[PDB]
């Protein structure tokens, strides 16, 4: 669909069969989500945000549905203000910016 | 235009007579720019994201030129790692997310 930006672009996503609210974030290279349980091993990763760097747990090939579209990619778990859907997954659902 | 998200959606903008590179950011409520001089009054503000909060100076009714467009609105100036064009200005140029 088409999402205008007068309000935060918050959508419903599904991870591990559980529904959650997330933000479509074109300014984030990666997808960062709140603490939750995920399958498999994770590896270390540091990301730089507006306030500085933080450590997160990186889980690859995680199945995640975004507003109906299924994607399978890297998800980072850590202390984030919002569940953020970054470019790595926005590209998977064919999301683009238009104006 | 239609901007794909394979890479960071960076654009050149003109603010306060200065040219700067900036990131089109749907995850940002407002526009935040690196330290620079801007006309008019301002008030302190704290904004947070990944990594925590930073203090910025809020200036209202600031004019910015972006991709052939002239947008007007609030601009926050502070120690941001990236210059980001937020929703407050993205809406003014008719930016939307599509998939
Ligand atoms: C920018 C602004 C303006 C007004 C009010 C609050 C804020 C702060 N908002 C935010 O920080 C929001 N974030 C955003 O809007 C993001 O697009 C953010 C932009 C950015 C990039 C480089 C330096 C600094 C900022 N990007 C990242 O944090 C980011 C950047 C690179 C990789 C990565 O995995 C991530 C998560 C993600 S967390 C958030 C949804 C709260």
Swiss-Prot record, chains A, B:
Instruction: Spell out where the chain crosses the membrane.
Output: none
- State the residue spans of region: Dimerization of protease: 1-5, 49-55, 88-99
Q: Where is the active site?
A: 25 (for protease activity)
Residues forming the Peptidase A2 domain are 20-89
Q: How does it assemble?
A: Homodimer, whose active site consists of two apposed aspartic acid residues.
Stated name of the protein? Protease
